[PDB]
Design a protein around this motif. Structure first.
Motif, PDB file in Angstrom:
ATOM      1  N   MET A   1       0.877  -1.207   0.000  1.00 34.96           N
ATOM      2  CA  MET A   1       0.000   0.000   0.000  1.00 34.96           C
ATOM      3  C   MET A   1       0.896   1.233   0.000  1.00 34.96           C
ATOM      4  SD  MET A   1      -3.233  -0.748   2.647  1.00 34.96           S
ATOM      5  CE  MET A   1      -2.080  -0.434   3.988  1.00 34.96           C
ATOM      6  N   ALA A   2       1.896   1.216  -0.908  1.00 30.74           N
ATOM      7  CA  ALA A   2       2.412   2.394  -1.579  1.00 30.74           C
ATOM      8  C   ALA A   2       1.359   3.475  -1.762  1.00 30.74           C
ATOM      9  CB  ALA A   2       2.927   1.986  -2.937  1.00 30.74           C
ATOM     10  N   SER A   3       1.616   4.625  -1.116  1.00 27.99           N
ATOM     11  CA  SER A   3       0.663   5.724  -1.094  1.00 27.99           C
ATOM     12  C   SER A   3       1.336   7.084  -1.253  1.00 27.99           C
ATOM     13  CB  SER A   3      -0.189   5.702   0.130  1.00 27.99           C
ATOM     14  OG  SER A   3       0.481   6.408   1.128  1.00 27.99           O
ATOM     15  N   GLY A   4       0.715   7.961  -2.066  1.00 26.92           N
ATOM     16  CA  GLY A   4       1.212   9.326  -2.331  1.00 26.92           C
ATOM     17  C   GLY A   4       0.682  10.392  -1.370  1.00 26.92           C
ATOM     18  N   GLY A   5       1.481  11.373  -0.980  1.00 27.64           N
ATOM     19  CA  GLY A   5       0.984  12.477  -0.154  1.00 27.64           C
ATOM     20  C   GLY A   5       0.322  13.625  -0.945  1.00 27.64           C
ATOM     21  N   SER A   6       0.559  14.866  -0.501  1.00 26.06           N
ATOM     22  CA  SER A   6      -0.195  16.036  -0.950  1.00 26.06           C
ATOM     23  C   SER A   6       0.051  16.359  -2.401  1.00 26.06           C
ATOM     24  CB  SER A   6       0.100  17.197  -0.073  1.00 26.06           C
ATOM     25  OG  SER A   6      -0.336  16.918   1.324  1.00 26.06           O
ATOM     26  N   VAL A   7      -0.964  16.956  -3.070  1.00 23.30           N
ATOM     27  CA  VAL A   7      -0.870  17.502  -4.456  1.00 23.30           C
ATOM     28  C   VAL A   7      -1.448  18.902  -4.369  1.00 23.30           C
ATOM     29  CG1 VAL A   7      -1.698  17.309  -6.861  1.00 23.30           C
ATOM     30  CG2 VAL A   7      -1.595  15.326  -5.415  1.00 23.30           C
ATOM     31  N   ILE A   8      -0.940  19.821  -5.163  1.00 24.85           N
ATOM     32  CA  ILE A   8      -1.567  21.130  -5.120  1.00 24.85           C
ATOM     33  C   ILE A   8      -1.591  21.694  -6.507  1.00 24.85           C
ATOM     34  CG2 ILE A   8      -0.931  21.713  -2.696  1.00 24.85           C
ATOM     35  CD1 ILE A   8       1.221  23.360  -3.451  1.00 24.85           C
ATOM     36  N   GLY A   9      -2.513  22.622  -6.723  1.00 23.67           N
ATOM     37  CA  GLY A   9      -2.612  23.282  -8.013  1.00 23.67           C
ATOM     38  C   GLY A   9      -3.176  24.684  -7.945  1.00 23.67           C
ATOM     39  N   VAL A  10      -2.767  25.532  -8.897  1.00 20.20           N
ATOM     40  CA  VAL A  10      -3.282  26.896  -8.903  1.00 20.20           C
ATOM     41  C   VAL A  10      -3.362  27.410 -10.306  1.00 20.20           C
ATOM     42  CG1 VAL A  10      -1.064  28.137  -8.555  1.00 20.20           C
ATOM     43  CG2 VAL A  10      -3.180  29.121  -7.697  1.00 20.20           C
ATOM     44  N   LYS A  11      -4.423  28.173 -10.590  1.00 17.80           N
ATOM     45  CA  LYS A  11      -4.578  28.854 -11.870  1.00 17.80           C
ATOM     46  C   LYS A  11      -3.928  30.207 -11.863  1.00 17.80           C
ATOM     47  CE  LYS A  11      -9.127  27.065 -13.217  1.00 17.80           C
ATOM     48  NZ  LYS A  11     -10.574  27.328 -13.110  1.00 17.80           N
ATOM     49  N   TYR A  12      -3.246  30.549 -12.937  1.00 15.77           N
ATOM     50  CA  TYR A  12      -2.748  31.905 -13.085  1.00 15.77           C
ATOM     51  C   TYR A  12      -3.168  32.438 -14.461  1.00 15.77           C
ATOM     52  CZ  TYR A  12       0.894  29.742 -15.874  1.00 15.77           C
ATOM     53  OH  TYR A  12       1.488  28.944 -16.815  1.00 15.77           O
ATOM     54  N   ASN A  13      -2.838  33.691 -14.775  1.00 17.72           N
ATOM     55  CA  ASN A  13      -3.200  34.279 -16.067  1.00 17.72           C
ATOM     56  C   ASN A  13      -2.457  33.604 -17.204  1.00 17.72           C
ATOM     57  OD1 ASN A  13      -4.975  36.230 -14.904  1.00 17.72           O
ATOM     58  ND2 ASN A  13      -3.234  37.562 -14.466  1.00 17.72           N
ATOM     59  N   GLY A  14      -3.165  32.728 -17.926  1.00 16.62           N
ATOM     60  CA  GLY A  14      -2.585  32.044 -19.073  1.00 16.62           C
ATOM     61  C   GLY A  14      -2.417  30.542 -18.876  1.00 16.62           C
ATOM     62  N   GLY A  15      -2.734  30.011 -17.673  1.00 19.29           N
ATOM     63  CA  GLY A  15      -2.519  28.583 -17.482  1.00 19.29           C
ATOM     64  C   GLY A  15      -2.620  28.118 -16.052  1.00 19.29           C
ATOM     65  N   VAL A  16      -2.087  26.940 -15.762  1.00 20.67           N
ATOM     66  CA  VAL A  16      -2.302  26.408 -14.407  1.00 20.67           C
ATOM     67  C   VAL A  16      -1.084  25.575 -14.062  1.00 20.67           C
ATOM     68  CG1 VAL A  16      -3.724  24.688 -15.539  1.00 20.67           C
ATOM     69  CG2 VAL A  16      -3.923  24.883 -13.104  1.00 20.67           C
ATOM     70  N   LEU A  17      -0.765  25.575 -12.789  1.00 27.24           N
ATOM     71  CA  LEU A  17       0.326  24.816 -12.239  1.00 27.24           C
ATOM     72  C   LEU A  17      -0.191  23.671 -11.408  1.00 27.24           C
ATOM     73  CD1 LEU A  17       2.636  27.656 -10.920  1.00 27.24           C
ATOM     74  CD2 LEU A  17       2.715  26.493 -13.083  1.00 27.24           C
ATOM     75  N   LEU A  18       0.418  22.507 -11.516  1.00 25.69           N
ATOM     76  CA  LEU A  18       0.154  21.422 -10.573  1.00 25.69           C
ATOM     77  C   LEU A  18       1.481  21.034  -9.932  1.00 25.69           C
ATOM     78  CD1 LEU A  18      -2.331  19.560  -9.877  1.00 25.69           C
ATOM     79  CD2 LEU A  18      -1.580  18.046 -11.578  1.00 25.69           C
TER      80      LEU A  18
END
Lengths: 227, 218
Positions: free
Chosen positions: B1-18
């Motif tokens: 049970m290999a498990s991943g922690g936190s993910v985050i994302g945000v939109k900015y003018n022209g695109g989005v970051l993950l």
């Protein structure tokens, strides 16, 4: 002469006539040629147009079955199409279950097996198409034909349909150790233009596809600016 | 049970970051510190998830295959919005059989110069928004991205990177099962690109952290 009504029956000579007749569909359909080259495979078919008011891309005989493989249906088109869906399931199966692009020899084997089975049950009839298989997976460039009997054979070059006896004579003058995908697109198109009968089929276009090192081993219709 | 922690994302003018880290854990054990957790799905779209890595692998496989097959058999290239919809239906279905996908997804992308970002949780809840997160991202990051986006007219690419990194730094400080090693994907101009891993600068040298002041007995 009751012996020719079901394909579940040998004749007294050991023939299966329902399968012969289905092969006759193919032999009266339109002419397709193909060539297995150093860098890939090229297929070309001649679409007989039933109407000047068809959009382009209608009644396409060449379909992709996988990123790296495609088929050209010769004979009855909707029969051919049922063969395309099975070929895709097989190709998908190999990626899903075995993690590998299907090898070309294996895909052709599985298509044959599939066409064979409609040659043995009273309730179904043989398919009325042959299927050219063009692949370029880890086994290199391969060109196979399956036919309504379910026989599968590999080729360097081939021709099906009504023009096929002349086209075969011209495909014999090529040289299959040298020839590239670029040269073949030219030569195969010339052969379809010469075996074309002008009295009988006034409206036609050529379809042509390929899987080569140029296209990054992706099966795809050739760009229309090369004919 | 290999498990991943936190993910985050945000939109900015022209695109989005993950963004996420490159770690799979097993309980408290940091088992693999060099796993790329983000997956490109089609031409425009990128996904990641917190939770059970096996369930993420299975679900992205199924999706990537629908998307690639649909494109190859004449049905065009699915968009972020369509991918997202299909994901949420399958998450929901499995929940409805009591065989859930024990993950929480974040999906991002860019098509028609319009950036997408949305979340799907393991019972099928979905939402889109200017900032999404999963894991301890939802408690630690979102308060910062949300403060950042309060400014009127939105975020430039560079201000979106700065605030993504401050969140990363807090996760690294306060999330047990993490590491200082992260990737960022950027959806923009109708395509996604995944960066090489990087590390954030941290602080450990405050006088209030010294041995004498933190001593329980003088």
């Amino acid at each position: 002469t009751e012996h020719d009504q079901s394909t579940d029956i040998f004749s007294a000579d050991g023939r299966v006539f329902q399968v012969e007749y289905a092969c006759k569909a193919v032999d009266n359909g339109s002419t397709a040629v193909a060539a297995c080259c150093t860098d890939g495979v090229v297929v070309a078919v001649e679409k007989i147009l039933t109407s000047r008011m068809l959009e382009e891309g209608s009644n396409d005989r060449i379909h992709a079955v996988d990123r790296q493989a495609g088929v050209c249906i010769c004979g009855m088109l909707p029969d051919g199409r049922a063969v395309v869906s099975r070929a895709r399931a097989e190709a998908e199966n190999s990626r899903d279950v075995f993690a590998t692009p299907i090898p070309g020899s294996v895909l052709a084997s599985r298509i044959g097996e599939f066409m064979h089975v409609y040659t043995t049950h009273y309730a179904y009839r043989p398919f009325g198409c042959s299927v050219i298989i063009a692949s370029y997976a880890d086994d290199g460039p391969q060109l196979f034909v399956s036919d309504p009997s379910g026989t599968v054979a590999g080729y360097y070059g081939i021709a099906l349909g009504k023009g096929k006896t002349v086209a075969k004579t011209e495909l014999e003058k090529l040289n299959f150790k040298s020839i590239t995908c670029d040269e073949a697109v030219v030569k195969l198109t010339k052969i379809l233009h010469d075996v074309h009968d002008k009295s009988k089929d006034k409206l036609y276009e050529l379809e042509v596809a390929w899987v080569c090192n140029k296209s990054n081993c992706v099966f795809q219709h050739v760009p229309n600016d090369m004919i | 049970m290999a498990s991943g922690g936190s993910v985050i994302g945000v939109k900015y003018n022209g695109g989005v970051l993950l963004a996420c880290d490159t770690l799979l854990s097993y309980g408290s054990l940091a088992k693999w510190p060099n796993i790329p957790r983000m997956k490109l799905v089609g031409a425009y779209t990128v996904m990641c998830a917190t939770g059970d890595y096996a369930d993420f692998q299975e679900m992205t496989t199924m999706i990537e295959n629908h998307v690639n097959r649909q494109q190859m058999y004449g049905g065009g290239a699915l968009t972020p919005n369509e991918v997202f919809c299909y994901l949420q239906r399958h998450v929901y279905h499995k929940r409805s059989q009591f065989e859930p996908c024990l993950c929480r997804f974040v999906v991002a992308g860019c098509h028609g110069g319009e950036p997408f970002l949305g979340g799907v949780d393991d019972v099928g809840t979905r939402w889109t928004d200017d900032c999404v997160a999963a894991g301890y991202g939802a408690y630690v990051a979102l308060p910062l991205l949300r403060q950042a986006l309060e400014k009127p007219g939105g975020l430039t690419r560079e201000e979106a990177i700065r605030v993504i990194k401050d969140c990363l730094r807090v996760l690294f400080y306060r999330e047990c099962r993490a590491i200082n090693k992260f990737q960022i994907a950027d959806a923009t101009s109708d395509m996604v690109s995944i960066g090489e891993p990087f590390e954030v600068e941290t602080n450990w040298e405050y006088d209030g952290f010294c041995f004498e002041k933190t001593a329980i007995i003088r």
